[PDB]
Design a protein around this ligand. Structure first.
Ligand SMILES: C=CC(=O)N[C@@](C)(c1ccc(F)cc1)c1cnc(N2CCN(c3ncnn4cc(-c5cnn(C)c5)cc34)CC2)nc1
Ligand SMILES: [Br-]
Length: 277
């Protein structure tokens, strides 16, 4: 017991992140749910004389102790992770003088799914239109983000286009009852979530991407037949504009044996080779 893994959620909050509540002005609500809301805000002097747009996550009024501790643990996890270009990074927090506020980067173009759908009419494979080069970049960037998360012992558990955000410079950033159509069979059948199950979900994301935001398994409801087909080995066919080499990645991501799926590190190297050619 002399050597143990350091659990980042057990570490104390680092006040280098602290930011004055009075220097935040809330704007539009970016997301709202049962647990609380995420708002766009202006943070004055976050990086001294200038204000920057940020996102602020906050809990519901007078939240129970378990909910507040969960937000703090999520804050602590972000602090230990460190910065990466392809994740929504932590920028600061307000932990006293009121409820806990978590300040992260703001992604001006919103979620990738709605972006793909609103760019679908304008899409052309080869050349401000969306192109195959853009889709390849999005696939590469999401793989780099997940490879970074995986190397840090993190599992996303809800990887999907709706949970990818797009910001300036065509940079995609990963953010955050069950998303059945994105889940690996072992997650559905055994409630197991692993590095390998995240890879399965990334394959579903690729199908979303090259389908320009179509819903997976189109026209198929989630029922007994769906689960039986998935278990028996049924997989989605290729989107019309997915390069063959990208569909190959999708198929390996969807291997029934989690051990035969690629790692995100391998996916990154594969996509890097495609981008050069
Ligand atoms: C029932 C469930 C539930 O409680 N859910 C949540 C409410 C929750 C809230 C507080 C909690 F304490 C716990 C959980 C919850 C709700 N929403 C979100 N997200 C995540 C981060 N999103 C963005 N982050 C950074 N930049 N950015 C730019 C845009 C953008 C730009 N243009 N447009 C149109 C949108 C969006 C973002 C914002 C929305 N996260 C989480
Ligand atoms: Br299909």
């Amino acid at each position: 017991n002399n050597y143990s893994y350091i659990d980042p959620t057990q570490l104390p909050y680092d006040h280098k992140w602290e930011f004055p509540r009075n220097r935040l002005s809330f704007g539009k609500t970016l997301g709202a749910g049962a647990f609380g809301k995420v708002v766009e805000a202006t943070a004055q002097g976050l990086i001294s004389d200038a204000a920057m747009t940020v996102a602020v996550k906050m809990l519901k009024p007078s939240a129970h102790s378990t909910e507040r501790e969960a937000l703090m643990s999520e804050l602590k996890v972000l602090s230990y992770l460190g910065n990466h270009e392809n994740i929504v990074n932590l920028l600061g927090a307000c932990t006293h003088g009121g409820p806990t506020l978590v300040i992260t980067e703001y992604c001006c173009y919103g979620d990738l799914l709605n972006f793909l759908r609103r760019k679908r009419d304008e899409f052309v494979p080869y050349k401000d239109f969306l192109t195959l080069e853009h889709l390849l970049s999005f696939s590469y960037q999401v793989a780099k983000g997940m490879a970074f998360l995986a190397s840090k012992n993190c599992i996303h558990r809800d990887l999907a286009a709706r949970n990818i955000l797009l910001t300036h410079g065509n940079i995609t950033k990963i953010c955050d009852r069950l998303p059945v159509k994105w889940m690996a069979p072992e997650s559905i059948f055994n409630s197991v979530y692993t590095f390998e199950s995240d890879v399965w979900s990334y394959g579903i994301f690729l199908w979303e991407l090259f389908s320009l935001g179509s819903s997976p398994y189109p026209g198929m409801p989630v029922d007994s037949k769906f689960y039986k087909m998935i278990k028996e080995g049924f997989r989605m066919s290729s989107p019309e504009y997915a390069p063959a080499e990208m569909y190959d990645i999708m198929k390996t991501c969807w291997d029934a044996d989690p051990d035969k799926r690629p790692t995100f590190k391998q996916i990154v190297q594969d996509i890097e080779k495609q981008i050069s050619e």
